[PDB]
Amino acid sequence: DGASSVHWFRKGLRLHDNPALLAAVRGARCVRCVYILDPWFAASSSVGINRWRFLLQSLEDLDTSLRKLNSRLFVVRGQPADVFPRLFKEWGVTRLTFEYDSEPFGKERDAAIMKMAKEAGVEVVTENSHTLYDLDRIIELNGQKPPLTYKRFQALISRMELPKKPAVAVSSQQMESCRAEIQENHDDTYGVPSLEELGFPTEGLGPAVWQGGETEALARLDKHLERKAWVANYERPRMNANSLLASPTGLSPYLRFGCLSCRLFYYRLWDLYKKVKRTPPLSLFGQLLWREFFYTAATNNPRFDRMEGNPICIQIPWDRNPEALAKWAEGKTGFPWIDAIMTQLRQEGWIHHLARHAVACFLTRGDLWVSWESGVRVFDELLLDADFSVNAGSWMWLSCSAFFQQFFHCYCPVGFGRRTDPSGDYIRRYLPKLKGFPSRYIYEPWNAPESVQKAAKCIIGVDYPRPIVNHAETSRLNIERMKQIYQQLS
């Protein structure tokens, strides 16, 4: 008997490698794809324009793909626990499918939905295609606790099956054939909203730096895996000035929203390795494996993104310093390297991993001694590839709050920028107020003589702030403080 299925998009915003959507379609007489938009989400949230644009463009891409099959995405407004009982009744739903969510809050949401579906006679299929592995299997093999060091994680997955291959494509014919009739007034209720409807400024015609959606994700995957990009990205990567700019082959926002399947990426990367080198090392997959590591650590920890009550996080007496945090968040620290990175993050929504090391170091154990929790919140607002697991996980790792086995140094907020871009043009691009400084002073403009500041038409302390701390004194004190925190544990 043919099901009436609803496939629920949350992440996994794609039609390729979507085993949950396969389960919705197989043996269905009727299928509807829904995204549930909580109309009061923003009331509790301060998420910025770049993440909203990326989400909306991802939903518009799904709707465009569904229109090719004479169907539509249903953007249902409400909270899942409220709308699903109505949808079940009104649409006569017999099956609900969705990609598994490992994050503690989503797991609790989904468990409640599964209870309500069971009560209503609705079958539920979930598939764990957001990650490479069954995270619960990793934890099970580790004595029912997540690994807390990366080598242990690698040992565990090294005695597990390989990640599942990407699922086969849903039949275009099957999907158009089993579609729900779209009403002409679909957009009364179920349309994808425009950015201007969310109060954001009017969008231009030019493309975003990071255009959302599955179509863009797959085009980027293709370019990313061109042989001509193999040396630059996998054989001999270099952290140079050009690396700091958003790359047209970058995949991380698409992986985070599920516009790109991590299993597809994994096996296409393996395929390219085979062609070029004629069994790859684990390091080939490091980007995906570190992501999986943080997902595994997060899934059973509802306090993962907090310090207090987080069982894996050392309790550190961070300063309560809202003025410093606000300066850090707005790029007003007076360190042009830090400020340019935070400006790029706010303007575009992606910054290089080593630039994330730099600004997170400055906020937490390197300089300002503000809790990593506040850095998590700012990255959640602004960073396209941040989610509960990788954001908090990376901040705890970087700040030596969790996963600690050895100390590693924070980069210098002057020297690291100077080395990465000796030209200073990264600074000039994101902090044009500083553009007249010669490259000798542009990373440390408080050291420029008054003659140079006058000719650069930027007087430090007036047109651009003085550095908010003395880095040499502050970082040595902070190192001393952290060392004592850890050595005292004995």
Ligand X SMILES: O=C1NCCN1C[C@H](O)Cn1c2ccc(F)cc2c2cc(F)ccc21
Site for ligand X in 222-241 (CB under 6 A): none
How far is residue 398 from each of residues 54, 282, 317, measured CA to CA in Å?
27, 22, 16
Judged by CB under 6 A, the residue of 33, 383, 431, 456 near ligand X is 383
Contact status: 290 vs ligand X (CB under 6 A): yes
Spatial distance between the Cα atoms of 73 and 180, rounded to a whole number of angstroms: 11
CB of 288 to ligand X, least distance (A): 11
| Identity at 438, one-letter amino acid code | P
438, 452 contact by CB (below 8 A) = yes
End-to-end CA distance of the chain, in Å?
Answer: 64
Looking at 1-9, 128-136, 333-341, 351-359, which segment touches ligand X (CB under 6 A)? 351-359
402-441 residues in contact with ligand X (CB under 6 A) are none
Least gap, CB of 257 to ligand X (angstroms): 13
Q: Select 69 or 297, whichever has its Cβ closest to ligand X.
A: 297
The size of the interface with ligand X (CB under 6 A), counted in residues, is 14
Q: In angstroms, give the least distance from the CB of 397 to ligand X.
A: 6
Q: Select the residue interacting with ligand X from 18, 299, 333, 391 (CB under 6 A).
A: 391
List of residues 6+ apart from 222 with CB closer than 8 A: none
Output the smallest distance, CB 473 to ligand X, in A: 23
Amino acid, single-letter form, for residue 452: V
Does 360 participate in binding ligand X (rule CB under 6 A)? yes
Q: According to CB under 6 A, which residues from 118 to 137 bind ligand X?
A: none
Shortest Å, Cβ 354 to ligand X: 7
Compute the chain's Rg from CA coordinates.
24
CB of 290 to ligand X, least distance (A): 4
Residue among 264, 246, 243 at smallest CA distance from 255: 264
Question: Does residue 252 have a known ligand-binding role?
Answer: yes
341 binds ligand X (CB under 6 A): no
Part in contact with ligand X (CB under 6 A); list of ranges 61-69, 136-144, 350-358, 430-438: 350-358
Q: Pick from 337, 379, 430, 441: which binds ligand X (CB under 6 A)?
A: 379
Q: Which is nearer to ligand X, 94 or 301 (CB)?
A: 301
The CB-of-323 to ligand X minimum distance in angstroms stands at 21
262 is a contact residue toward ligand X (CB under 6 A)? no
Q: Confirm or reject binding of residue 297 to ligand X (CB under 6 A).
A: no
Q: Determine if residue 155 is labeled as part of a ligand binding site.
A: no
The residues pairing with 96 across neighbouring beta strands, listed in sequence order, are: 6, 124
Q: Is 439 annotated as a binding residue?
A: no
- Show the DSSP H helices in 69-103 as ranges: 80-91
On whether the CB atoms of residues 255 and 265 are closer than 8 A, the answer is yes
Residue 229 assigned ligand-binding role: no
Q: How far is CA 388 from the centre of its chain?
A: 9
Q: Kindly tell me which residue out of 76, 297, 338, 398 binds ligand X, with binding defined by CB under 6 A.
A: 398
* 3 state DSSP class of 125: strand
Residues 6+ apart with CB under 8 A from 47: 380, 381
Proportion of the chain in helix, strand, coil states, percent, rounded to 5? 50, 10, 40
Beta strands in 385-435 (DSSP E): none
Amino acid type, 301? N
Q: Beta-carbon neighbour count of residue 232 at 10 Å?
A: 14
Interacting positions 130-169 with ligand X (CB under 6 A): none
- Asked if 394 is part of the footprint of ligand X (rule: CB under 6 A), the reply reads yes
Query: What is the per-residue burial (b if ≥16 Cβ within 10 Å, else e) of 453-482?
Result: beebebebeeebbebbbebeebbeebeeeb
CB atoms within 10 A of CB 155: 13
63 is in an annotated binding site: no
Binding of ligand X at residue 390 (CB under 6 A)?
yes
With both helix axes pointing from N to C terminus, report the angle between 104-119 and 80-91 in degrees, rounded to the nearest 10.
Answer: 30
Q: Which range binds ligand X by CB under 6 A, 177-185, 239-247, 261-269, 377-385?
A: 377-385
Segment interacting with ligand X, rule: CB under 6 A, options 8-16, 181-189, 215-223, 379-387:
379-387
385 is in an annotated binding site: yes
Q: Residues within the annotated binding site for FAD?
A: 252, 287, 353, 385-387
- The residues of the shown chain that bind ligand X, judged by CB under 6 A, are 290, 353, 356-357, 360, 379, 383, 385-386, 390-391, 394-395, 398
